[PDB]
Design a protein around this ligand. Structure first.
Ligand SMILES: Oc1ccc2nc(-c3cccc4c(O)cccc34)oc2c1
Ligand SMILES: Oc1ccc2nc(-c3cccc4c(O)cccc34)oc2c1
Lengths: 231, 9, 227, 9
């Protein structure tokens, strides 16, 4: 399967656009967190089917599919937020009916920190002019490089991760820029993964505290995806 | 459940 | 400043190996944390000297310098560990005389897990056969990437340019150079994760009074020196 | 002090 055809499969695995069905209106600490947990829960469902459409994912042992997803879900959600927010400086496009500002994150303690991380990383991808196909490979890579018969699944994973890496290199090569510039671009995109992982670790620590306080309705899927981490 | 969604369609 | 000059400059900037002795008796929860905290404290001092030698670092504002170091210190220490442990499967060479097996990590509640990440990541670098010059560039990239703001981006590209230059001098095909560059950088996320877990663990050991946390070490732990 | 090492040395 050529790099271009692998990227096409990622395009076809893209989850549908999600809305929380909230009539437009100002945000409060309650409505905001409730809207975020509600959105994360909906997205997690689509994320699982997304992962299964990635060639070879379903061939990994069940132990690996679960551990990869439990490990990377938050980062994958945030990478989606960044691609969606790219054409809208200053805003975090969590969803069409869930658009927030930096000042909106002030009502909730500890979240302004997280919004700033997300906005900064988004601003970075924006100046690099992240392309849709790059976004697709990077997101797949986050899933396949997150965690870590018995040894068989292992090679399957390395093979799959290498295949998506190969696809990202291909995408960059098609931009038709200098070879040296292709290298600088690949390194610049990958170095941002560290920042997504960081915002992710902070985002989950904050959600965890919210849960322990029972201040937010933590739906079933979101709840277990969360506890798996704590575990 | 993560597992039931990974095993059904 | 050419890539080679950058690399040569980082080579010279390498910190001397910190000499810390392994406790006489077999580790106890307390003596292990004592050794790890003292080591980190001594290494942090050399890390700052090292950082000041990275081309252009001092030209950034004091505030950016402080925030880069507060944010990446543990990651940097850990990258050094992995490099030092690369030719020693199964072992973690925290220092010349502080060689730990994964087993000893049992006397400390919750550290075995961290030792696992570290050994795992080390294995990947070993498998990729990480080279000295690559290592130098990567460690510096870790510091410059834990993000004047414009000068920082240029400094980061310069070191990246250097890393690319090193990989090309290996002579592998152009397509394989891109692939190796990706394989090496994809591991930074892992180092960052292990750092997060290591700092969270250190904080807990401090709160549980399992070990005292030094002035410098504590400032770096809290990470809000500027307030 | 982080700031000290950075500027005093
Ligand atoms: O597409 C996205 C992208 C990023 C997200 N972050 C959350 C999120 C959900 C629940 C609690 C949180 C929290 O307490 C802090 C920061 C983020 C959250 O949902 C998200 C959905
Ligand atoms: O050159 C190194 C490389 C890695 C290190 N990790 C520590 C460390 C220091 C203090 C507390 C810890 C902890 O609580 C968990 C894991 C690691 C630590 O010191 C280190 C020094």
């Amino acid at each position: 399967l050529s790099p271009e055809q692998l990227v096409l499969t990622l395009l076809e695995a893209e989850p549908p656009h999600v809305l929380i069905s909230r009539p437009s209106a100002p945000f409060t600490e309650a409505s905001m967190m409730m809207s975020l947990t509600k959105l994360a829960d909906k997205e997690l469902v689509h994320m699982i089917s997304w992962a299964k459409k990635i060639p070879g994912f379903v061939e990994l042992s069940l132990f690996d599919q679960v551990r990869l997803l439990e490990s990377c879900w938050m980062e994958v959600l945030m990478m989606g937020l960044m691609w969606r927010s790219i054409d809208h400086p200053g805003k975090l496009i969590f969803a069409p009916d869930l658009v927030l500002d930096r000042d909106e994150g002030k009502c909730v303690e500890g979240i302004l920190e997280i919004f700033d991380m997300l906005l900064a990383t988004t601003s970075r991808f924006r100046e690099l002019k992240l392309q849709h196909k790059e976004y697709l490979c990077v997101k797949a890579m986050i899933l396949l490089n997150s965690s870590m018969q018995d040894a068989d699944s292992s090679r399957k994973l390395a093979h799959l991760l290498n295949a998506v890496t190969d696809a990202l290199v291909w995408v960059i090569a098609k931009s038709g820029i200098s070879s040296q510039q292709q290298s600088m671009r690949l390194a610049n995109l990958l170095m941002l993964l560290s920042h997504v992982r960081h915002a992710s670790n902070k985002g989950m620590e904050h959600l965890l505290n919210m849960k322990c306080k029972n201040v937010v309705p933590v739906y079933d899927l979101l709840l277990e995806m969360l506890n798996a981490h704590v575990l | 459940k993560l597992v039931q969604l990974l095993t059904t369609t």
